[PDB]
């Protein structure tokens, strides 16, 4: 049920993106391996975003940005999110292609906070409905 599923899926995305932020920033783990490790833990359908991303990166001459965008479009219809989440997730991809280290980091944090905010909106809509 979409009102119910949406907050839960945002919460999962916030978890997974926090882990990827760390690996990008100070990890010694290749991004494809980090994403696959997350995919193994998360429930479907959000898990498939991360396994698709891992595949695209691994067997790919694609930038991380391009691999992310492609994985996002591929899985999008399986998720229970609104367009506002899509745009946030797209901005997260665009962020992977930022070369300035500090600016990239801060734009990843913005994505995460944006999801925190959308999670609240989604919980508020749910609660309104009950």
User: What does the alpha-carbon distance between residue 52 and residue 30 come to, in Å, rounded to a whole number?
Assistant: 15
**Cβ(118)–Cβ(88) below 8 Å:** yes
Of the chain, the end-to-end C-alpha distance in Å amounts to 14
The alpha-carbon radius of gyration of the chain (Å, integer) is: 14
Helix and strand element counts for the chain (H, E): 6, 0
Per the structure, the complete domain to which residue 3 belongs is given by: 1-130
User: What does the alpha-carbon distance between residue 12 and residue 18 come to, in Å, rounded to a whole number?
Assistant: 10
- How many domains is the chain partitioned into structurally? 1
Q: What is the DSSP letter of 65?
A: H
Stated in angstroms to one decimal place, the resolution of this structure is 2.3
Q: Is 62 helix (H, G, I), strand (E, B) or coil?
A: coil
User: What does the alpha-carbon distance between residue 72 and residue 79 come to, in Å, rounded to a whole number?
Assistant: 10
**Cβ(21)–Cβ(108) below 8 Å:** yes
Q: What is the DSSP letter of 80?
A: -
For 95-101, which contacts have Cβ atoms below 8 Å and span 24 or more sequence positions? Answer: 95/65, 96/24, 96/63, 96/64, 96/65, 96/68, 97/63, 97/64, 97/65
Residue 60 sits at φ, ψ, to 5 deg, of 180, 135
């Amino acid at each position: 049920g979409s009102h119910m599923e949406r907050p839960r899926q945002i919460r999962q995305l916030r978890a997974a993106l926090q882990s990827l932020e760390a690996e990008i920033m100070y990890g010694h783990t290749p991004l494809h391996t980090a994403s696959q490790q997350i995919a193994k833990q998360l429930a479907q359908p959000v898990s498939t975003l991360f396994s698709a991303f891992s595949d695209q990166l691994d067997k790919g001459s694609d930038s991380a940005k391009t691999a992310w965008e492609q994985s996002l479009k591929k899985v999008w219809d399986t998720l229970s999110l609104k367009k506002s989440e899509y745009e946030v997730l797209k901005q997260f991809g665009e962020t992977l292609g930022i070369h300035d280290r500090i600016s990239q980091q801060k734009h990843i944090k913005l994505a995460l906070t944006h999801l925190e905010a959308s999670e609240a909106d989604a919980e508020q809509a749910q609660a309104k409905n009950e």
